[PDB]
């Protein structure tokens, strides 16, 4: 994937039903490069009959988008708002306030979207601990997802909301994930339940270092104070500013009933289109157990992956060179997860 671009995948039944080895395919084509990727579940594929009876869902903690600032440049506050039920939430989308715009294509809407972020204030309805799949259903089940990543609560009995059990995100125009990579720059897997779309933009995780440079010098206040305020989740950037500031991108829509992955150090933003749910978690990998020793964290704010775990288990001869501290891998993000060499032969 010399150019870097997402890329989108349409596997059929036989090879959607493992998750960990359909990853390592999509690998093994490059898809990584691009730091983010689509999957099209096959058509029969569905991990839940109907969403009709969740208008009693609680979503215990709203947050009120405040998006500050100007000129492709911005920064988000989430302000906690008391708890609402979803048809209360589904209520306010809904309303002609808040409602999306009429548009005919993607483009109109985004140029929207970046004009009138300031303006109208949005509540989302994220971090929202649960499932929407059936007990049944085997096939890239968020909850039980059974990546590498379960030795954290395996190994430690530590269940880690959100990173290891899933979230649930109902979304109205408008609402707005600031550019982030994952905590501890893991995988991420987002399933659009329903409801309307929602897009994403992506750095190539191979120019994400060159994103973090130029964001320091536009909040230099904010990395003064912690090295990585990117993992705050609070810097929105424009298009047309990586444009003129020539950091690669790329732009895709997820659309109900898609799969969205993001891979380590693929730095992602994006916004949702209307009134939707989507589900999410982070998941692992063998390549990523590099990435999460060399991960640059949040000091500033209190309240972390020991990777003890996972070098012992899986890099068993840089155990005592990483204890020593003398370990010093350069990671290449073109190369394939090792898993991926199956489908490299
Ligand atoms: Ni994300
Ligand atoms: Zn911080």
């Excluded at 916004?271 to 000091?299: D, M, P």
Aim: charged share 25%; aromatic share 14%.
């Amino acid at each position: 994937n010399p150019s870097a671009r997402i890329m989108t995948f349409y596997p059929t039944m036989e090879e959607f039903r493992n998750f960990s080895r359909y990853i390592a395919y999509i690998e093994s084509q490059g898809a990584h490069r691009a730091g983010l990727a689509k999957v099209v579940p096959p058509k029969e594929w569905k991990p839940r009959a109907s969403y009709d009876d969740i208008d009693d869902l609680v979503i215990p903690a709203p947050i009120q988008q405040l998006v500050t600032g100007q000129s492709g440049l911005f920064t988000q506050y989430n302000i906690q708002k008391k708890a609402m039920t979803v048809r209360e939430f589904r209520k306010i989308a809904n309303s002609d306030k808040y409602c999306t715009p009429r548009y005919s294509e993607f483009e109109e809407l985004e140029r929207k979207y970046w004009k009138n972020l300031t303006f109208n204030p949005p509540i989302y309805g994220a971090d929202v601990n649960g499932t929407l799949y059936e007990k049944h259903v085997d096939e890239w089940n968020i909850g039980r997802l059974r990546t590498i990543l379960d030795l954290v609560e395996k190994e430690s009995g530590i269940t880690i909301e959100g990173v290891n059990t899933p979230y649930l995100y109902f979304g109205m125009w408008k609402t707005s994930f600031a550019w982030h990579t994952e905590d501890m720059d893991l995988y991420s897997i987002n399933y659009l339940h329903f409801g309307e779309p929602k897009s994403w933009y992506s750095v190539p995780p191979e120019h994400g270092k060159r994103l973090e440079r130029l964001a320091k010098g536009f909040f230099p206040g904010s990395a003064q104070s912690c090295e990585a305020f990117l993992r705050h989740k609070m810097t929105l950037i424009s298009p047309l500013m990586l444009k003129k500031y020539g950091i690669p991108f790329d732009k895709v829509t997820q659309e109900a009933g898609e799969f969205m992955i993001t891979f380590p150090y693929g730095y992602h933003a994006g916004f949702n289109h209307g009134f939707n749910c989507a589900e999410s978690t982070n998941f692992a990998t063998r390549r990523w157990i590099e990435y999460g020793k060399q991960a640059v964290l949040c000091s500033c704010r209190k309240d972390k992956i020991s990777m003890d775990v996972f070098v012992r288990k899986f890099q068993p001869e840089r155990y005592k060179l990483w204890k020593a501290g003398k370990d010093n891998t350069v990671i290449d993000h073109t190369l394939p997860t090792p898993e991926a060499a199956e489908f490299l032969k």
